[PDB]
Every structure is written in structure tokens, then in C-alpha cells.
Coordinates of C-alpha atoms and ligand atoms in Angstrom, one line a residue:
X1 CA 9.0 -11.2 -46.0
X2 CA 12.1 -10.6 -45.1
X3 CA 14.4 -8.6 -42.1
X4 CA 17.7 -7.2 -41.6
X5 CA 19.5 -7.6 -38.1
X6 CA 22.9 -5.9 -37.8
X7 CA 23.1 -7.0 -34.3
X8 CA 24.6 -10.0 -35.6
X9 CA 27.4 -8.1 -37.2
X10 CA 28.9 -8.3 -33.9
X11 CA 29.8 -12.0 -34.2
X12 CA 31.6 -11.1 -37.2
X13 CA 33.6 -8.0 -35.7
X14 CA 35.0 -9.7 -32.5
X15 CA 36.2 -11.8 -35.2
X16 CA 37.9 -9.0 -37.3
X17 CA 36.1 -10.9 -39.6
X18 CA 32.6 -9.8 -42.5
X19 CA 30.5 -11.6 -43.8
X20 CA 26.4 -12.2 -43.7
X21 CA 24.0 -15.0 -42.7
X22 CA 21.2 -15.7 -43.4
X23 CA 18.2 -17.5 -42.0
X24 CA 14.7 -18.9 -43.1
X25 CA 11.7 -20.5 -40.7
X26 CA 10.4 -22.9 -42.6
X27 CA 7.1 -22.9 -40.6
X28 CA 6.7 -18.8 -41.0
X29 CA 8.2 -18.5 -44.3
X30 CA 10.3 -15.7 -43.2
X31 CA 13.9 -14.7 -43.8
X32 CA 16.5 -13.1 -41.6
X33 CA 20.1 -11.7 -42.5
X34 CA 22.5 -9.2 -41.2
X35 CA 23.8 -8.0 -44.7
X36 CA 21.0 -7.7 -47.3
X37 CA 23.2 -6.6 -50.3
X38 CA 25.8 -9.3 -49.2
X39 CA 23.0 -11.8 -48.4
X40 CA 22.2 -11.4 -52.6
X41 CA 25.9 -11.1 -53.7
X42 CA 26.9 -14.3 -55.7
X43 CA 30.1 -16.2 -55.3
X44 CA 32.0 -18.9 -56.5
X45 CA 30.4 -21.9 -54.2
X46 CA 33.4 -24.1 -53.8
X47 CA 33.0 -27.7 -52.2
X48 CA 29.4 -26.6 -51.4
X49 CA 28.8 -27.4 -54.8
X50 CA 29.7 -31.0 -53.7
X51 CA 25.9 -31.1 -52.9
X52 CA 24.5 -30.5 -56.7
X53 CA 27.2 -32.5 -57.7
X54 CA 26.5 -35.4 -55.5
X55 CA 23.2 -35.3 -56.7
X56 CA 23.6 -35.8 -60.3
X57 CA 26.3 -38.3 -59.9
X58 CA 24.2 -40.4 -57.8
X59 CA 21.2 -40.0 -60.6
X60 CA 23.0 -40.9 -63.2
X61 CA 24.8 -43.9 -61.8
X62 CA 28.3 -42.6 -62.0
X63 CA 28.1 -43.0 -58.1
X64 CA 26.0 -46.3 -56.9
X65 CA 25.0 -45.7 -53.5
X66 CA 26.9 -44.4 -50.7
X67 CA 29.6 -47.4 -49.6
X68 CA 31.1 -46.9 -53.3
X69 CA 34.9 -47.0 -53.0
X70 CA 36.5 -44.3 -55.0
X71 CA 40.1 -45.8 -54.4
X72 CA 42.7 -42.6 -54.3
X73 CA 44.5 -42.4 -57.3
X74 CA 48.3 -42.8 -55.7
X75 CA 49.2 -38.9 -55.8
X76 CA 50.5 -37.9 -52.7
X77 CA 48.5 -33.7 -52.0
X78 CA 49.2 -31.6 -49.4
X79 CA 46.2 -32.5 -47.4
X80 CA 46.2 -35.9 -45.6
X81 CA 42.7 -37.3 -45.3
X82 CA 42.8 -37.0 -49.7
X83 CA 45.1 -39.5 -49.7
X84 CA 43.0 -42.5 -48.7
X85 CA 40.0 -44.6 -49.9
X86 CA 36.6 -42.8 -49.6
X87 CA 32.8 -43.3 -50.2
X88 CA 30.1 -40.4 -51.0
X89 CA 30.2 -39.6 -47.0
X90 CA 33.6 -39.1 -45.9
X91 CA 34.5 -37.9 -49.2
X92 CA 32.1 -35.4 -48.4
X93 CA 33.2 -35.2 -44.5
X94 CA 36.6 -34.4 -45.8
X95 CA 35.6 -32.2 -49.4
X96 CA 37.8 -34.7 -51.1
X97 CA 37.7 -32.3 -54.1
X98 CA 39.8 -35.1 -56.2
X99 CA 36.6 -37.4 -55.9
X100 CA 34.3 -34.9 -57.0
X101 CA 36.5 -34.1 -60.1
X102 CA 36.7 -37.7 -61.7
X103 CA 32.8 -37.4 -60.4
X104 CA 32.4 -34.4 -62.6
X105 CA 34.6 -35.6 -65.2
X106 CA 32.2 -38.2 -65.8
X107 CA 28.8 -36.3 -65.8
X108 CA 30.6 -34.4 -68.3
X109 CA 29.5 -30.7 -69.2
X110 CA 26.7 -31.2 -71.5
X111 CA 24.9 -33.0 -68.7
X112 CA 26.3 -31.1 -65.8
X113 CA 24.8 -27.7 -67.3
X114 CA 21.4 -29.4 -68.0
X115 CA 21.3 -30.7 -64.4
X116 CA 22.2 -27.4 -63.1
X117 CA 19.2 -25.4 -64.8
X118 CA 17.0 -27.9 -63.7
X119 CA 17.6 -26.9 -60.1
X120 CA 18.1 -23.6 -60.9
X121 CA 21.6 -23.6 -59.4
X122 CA 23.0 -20.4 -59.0
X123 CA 23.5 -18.8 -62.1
X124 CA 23.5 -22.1 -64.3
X125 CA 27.1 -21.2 -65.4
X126 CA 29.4 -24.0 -65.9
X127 CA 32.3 -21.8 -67.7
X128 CA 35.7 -23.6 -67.2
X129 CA 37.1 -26.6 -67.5
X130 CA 34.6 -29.4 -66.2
X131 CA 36.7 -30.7 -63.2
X132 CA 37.3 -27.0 -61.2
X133 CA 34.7 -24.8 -62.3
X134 CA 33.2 -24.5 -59.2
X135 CA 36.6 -23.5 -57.9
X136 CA 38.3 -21.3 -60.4
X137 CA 35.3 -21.3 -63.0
X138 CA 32.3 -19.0 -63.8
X139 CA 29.6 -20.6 -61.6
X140 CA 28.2 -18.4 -58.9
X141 CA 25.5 -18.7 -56.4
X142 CA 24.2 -16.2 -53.3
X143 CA 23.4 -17.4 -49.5
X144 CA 20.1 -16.6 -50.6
X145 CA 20.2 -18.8 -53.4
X146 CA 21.5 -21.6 -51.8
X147 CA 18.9 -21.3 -49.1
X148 CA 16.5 -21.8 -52.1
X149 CA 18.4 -24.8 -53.4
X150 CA 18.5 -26.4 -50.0
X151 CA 14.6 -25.9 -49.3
X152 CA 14.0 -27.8 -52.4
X153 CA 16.2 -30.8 -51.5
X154 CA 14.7 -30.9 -48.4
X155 CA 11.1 -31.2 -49.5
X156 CA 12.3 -33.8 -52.5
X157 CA 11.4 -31.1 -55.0
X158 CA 14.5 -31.0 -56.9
X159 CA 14.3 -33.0 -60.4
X160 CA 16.1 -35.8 -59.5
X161 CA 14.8 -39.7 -58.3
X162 CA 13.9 -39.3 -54.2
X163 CA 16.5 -41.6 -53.5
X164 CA 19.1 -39.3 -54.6
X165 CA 18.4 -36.4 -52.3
X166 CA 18.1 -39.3 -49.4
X167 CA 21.3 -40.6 -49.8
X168 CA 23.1 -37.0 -50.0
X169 CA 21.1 -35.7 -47.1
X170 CA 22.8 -38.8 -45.6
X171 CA 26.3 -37.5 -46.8
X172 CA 25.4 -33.9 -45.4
X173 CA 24.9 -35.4 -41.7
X174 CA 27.0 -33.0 -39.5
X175 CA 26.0 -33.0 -36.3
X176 CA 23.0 -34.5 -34.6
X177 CA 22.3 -34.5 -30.1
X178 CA 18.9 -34.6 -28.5
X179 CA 18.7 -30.7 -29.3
X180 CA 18.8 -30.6 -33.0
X181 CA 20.2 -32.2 -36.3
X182 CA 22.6 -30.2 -38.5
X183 CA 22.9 -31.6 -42.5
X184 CA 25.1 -28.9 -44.1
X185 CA 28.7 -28.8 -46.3
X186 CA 31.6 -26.4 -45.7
X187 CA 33.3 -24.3 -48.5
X188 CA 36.7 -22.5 -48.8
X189 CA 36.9 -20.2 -52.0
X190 CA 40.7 -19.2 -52.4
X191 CA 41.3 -19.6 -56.5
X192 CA 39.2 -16.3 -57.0
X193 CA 38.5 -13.0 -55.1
X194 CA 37.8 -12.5 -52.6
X195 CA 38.7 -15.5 -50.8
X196 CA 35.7 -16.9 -48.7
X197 CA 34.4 -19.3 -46.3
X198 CA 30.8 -20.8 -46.7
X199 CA 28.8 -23.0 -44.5
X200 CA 25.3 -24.2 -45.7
X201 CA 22.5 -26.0 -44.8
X202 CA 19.7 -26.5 -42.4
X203 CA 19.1 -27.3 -38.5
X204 CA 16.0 -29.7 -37.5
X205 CA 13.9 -29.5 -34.5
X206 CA 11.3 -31.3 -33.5
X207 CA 8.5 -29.0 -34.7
X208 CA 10.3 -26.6 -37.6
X209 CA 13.4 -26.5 -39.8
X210 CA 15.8 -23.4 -39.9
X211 CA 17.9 -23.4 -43.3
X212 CA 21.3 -21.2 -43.2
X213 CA 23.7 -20.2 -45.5
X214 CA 26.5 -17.9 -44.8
X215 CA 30.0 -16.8 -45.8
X216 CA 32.5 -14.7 -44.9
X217 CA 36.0 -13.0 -46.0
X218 CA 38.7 -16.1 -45.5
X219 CA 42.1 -14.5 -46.2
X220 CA 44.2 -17.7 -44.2
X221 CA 42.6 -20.9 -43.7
X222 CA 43.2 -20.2 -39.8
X223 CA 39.9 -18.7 -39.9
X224 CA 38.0 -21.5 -41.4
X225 CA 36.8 -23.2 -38.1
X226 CA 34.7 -19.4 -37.6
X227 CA 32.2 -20.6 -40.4
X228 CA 30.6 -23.0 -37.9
X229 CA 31.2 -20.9 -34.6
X230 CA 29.8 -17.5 -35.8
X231 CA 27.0 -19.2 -37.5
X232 CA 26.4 -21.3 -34.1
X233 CA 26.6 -17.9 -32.4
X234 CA 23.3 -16.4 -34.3
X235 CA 21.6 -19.6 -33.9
X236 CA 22.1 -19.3 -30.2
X237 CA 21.4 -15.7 -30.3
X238 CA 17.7 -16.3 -32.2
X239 CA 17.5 -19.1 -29.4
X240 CA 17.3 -22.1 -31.8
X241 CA 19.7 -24.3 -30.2
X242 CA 20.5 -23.7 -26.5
Ligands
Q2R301 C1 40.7 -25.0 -50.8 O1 41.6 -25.1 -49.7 C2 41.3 -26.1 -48.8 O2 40.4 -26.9 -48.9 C3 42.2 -26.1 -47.7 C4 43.4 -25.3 -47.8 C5 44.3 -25.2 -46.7 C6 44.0 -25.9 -45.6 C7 42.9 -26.6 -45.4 C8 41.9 -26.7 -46.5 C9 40.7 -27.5 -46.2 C10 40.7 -28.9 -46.3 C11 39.6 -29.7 -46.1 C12 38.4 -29.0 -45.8 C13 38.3 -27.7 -45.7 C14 37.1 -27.0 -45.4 O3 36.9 -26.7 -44.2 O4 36.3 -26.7 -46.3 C15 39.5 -26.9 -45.9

């Protein structure tokens, strides 16, 4: 079952912003969204693919654990917190794409694909050049796929070792207070239009677990700290978090 709000659109519009989420209670199996269509519309997932790809570099030992220093390579890019020593969690913290491309580079695309259709990523599309297709390449996934992708992860259920999906829930600790815990990773599409914003995940409470996914239309990254607050709105709104 599923159920279409558009009182949420109104988050989105004081905003001049558009863009859907979309919720599922895990206890009552249900799904809630503002956009239906957009709710199914696949787009490129950007550094929320730094989830899948986490996964598969951790099971196939390109990444050991989580204090593995990826030193930075000595190039100088226009964002500061790249140019620094990282592990798996502040690379992820930061979406230190350079990481995840010597990550991806090293998977390589014969085992990257496989991985992908095992978890029923998306569409399974790894088109491109191996270290940016989930930026520029043919790889697309909905907010109500990656919902799906997330409840497996949670639950262990994806086909890779337990200890994998441990250490990258780890990685995808955001937030956490006596209220609720957030585990979820940000994503700015630009390379392709339309140019978007995801944030996606799941908040944990004490007695059930709300996954989220959402994006939104992104043309400037001065809208990029409105993935979190418009998504924080609904969950206030569906009084989930206080
Ligand atoms: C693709 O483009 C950028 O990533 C980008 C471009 C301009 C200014 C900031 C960022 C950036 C940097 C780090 C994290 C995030 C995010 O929140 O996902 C965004």
C-alpha cells in the first residue's frame, strides 16, 4: 500500500524549490510520498552510490575496514576537505568522490556490474567509464528504489558478508540524540540534467524504522543544505521526530 500527500509540496514551494519524498514504516509496511510519478522517476544517484560502492569494496578487500588511510593523491581540487587523508567514514562524511574512484577503479567493471545486479541497484547500468559513471554515466535509480536498496542493507539481506553492511552502516552515521538516529548519504547530480539534490536513508526509533529517500531540482549548490531541512520538515510534520 501506498499514499500520496501533496501537503508536503508546501515545504518544497516556500523553497521555490520541487522535488518528492518519500517514506516507508517499516512496522506497517506502508509508503508515503508527495509526487508519485516523481517518487518512480530514475536519476543518476551521485555520491549516494558511495553506499553500493562501499559495499563491494569492503567485500572484496579493496577496502580493509574502516581506519584504512586512502592518502590524497597530492592534487590540489576546488573543494577543501578532498585534499586530506581519509578513511571509509569521513571519506564518506565529506563524499570524497576521488576515494571512491581509485575504489571503483579497483573493483573494476566486470565485478562492479555483477555486484550491482546482485542488489538489484537501480537499473544495473554501469555504462561509462568505470571511475564516474555514477556521475556522468548511464546508471539510474528512483527514491523508491533506493528505499528498496536501503531496507535490504538494513535487514543484512543484501548479498554481501554481514560485516560489510555493519561497517558502511557505520560510515552512514549522520546524526544520532536521545530522539532518534539518522544513517543516510547526501547526493548532488550536476554532470547531467536535471541537476539534483538527494538525501537517503533511514531514521531509528525505539520501536520502528522510517526509511527516506528524496531529491529535488538543485540548479546552484546554495540550495544543497534544503535536502536535509525539507526532508526534516515532513518528518516533523508526520510527527516522527519532535
Ligand atoms: C558535485 O558537486 C559537489 O559535490 C559540490 C559542488 C560545489 C560545491 C559543493 C559541492 C559538495 C561538496 C561536498 C559534498 C556535497 C554534498 O552535500 O553532497 C557537495
Amino acid at each position: 500500500e501506498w499514499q500520496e500527500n501533496k501537503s508536503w509540496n508546501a515545504h518544497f514551494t516556500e523553497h521555490k524549490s520541487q522535488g518528492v519524498v518519500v517514506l516507508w514504516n517499516e512496522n506497517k509496511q506502508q509508503g508515503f510520498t508527495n509526487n508519485l510519478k516523481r517518487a518512480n522517476q530514475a536519476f543518476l544517484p551521485a555520491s549516494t552510490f558511495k553506499i553500493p560502492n562501499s559495499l563491494i569494496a569492503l567485500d572484496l578487500g579493496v577496502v580493509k575496514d574502516e581506519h584504512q588511510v586512502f592518502k590524497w593523491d597530492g592534487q590540489t581540487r576546488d573543494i577543501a576537505t578532498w585534499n586530506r587523508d581519509h578513511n571509509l567514514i569521513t571519506a564518506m562524511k565529506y563524499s570524497v568522490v576521488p576515494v571512491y574512484q581509485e575504489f571503483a577503479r579497483q573493483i573494476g567493471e566486470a565485478r562492479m556490474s555483477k555486484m550491482l545486479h546482485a542488489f538489484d541497484y537501480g537499473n544495473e547500468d554501469i555504462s561509462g567509464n568505470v571511475d564516474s559513471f555514477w556521475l556522468d554515466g548511464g546508471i539510474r535509480i528512483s527514491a523508491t528504489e533506493q528505499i528498496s536498496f536501503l531496507r535490504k542493507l538494513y535487514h543484512n539481506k543484501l548479498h554481501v558478508s554481514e560485516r560489510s553492511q555493519r561497517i558502511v552502516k557505520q560510515a552512514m552515521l549522520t546524526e544520532a540524540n536521545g530522539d532518534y538516529i539518522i544513517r543516510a548519504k547526501t547526493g548532488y547530480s550536476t554532470r547531467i540534467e536535471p541537476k539534483i539534490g538527494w538525501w537517503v536513508g533511514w531514521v531509528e526509533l525505539d520501536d520502528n524504522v522510517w526509511f527516506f529517500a528524496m531529491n529535488m531540482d538543485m540548479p546552484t549548490s546554495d540550495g544543497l543544505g534544503l535536502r536535509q531541512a525539507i526532508t526534516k520538515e515532513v518528518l516533523k510534520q508526520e510527527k516522527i521526530i519532535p
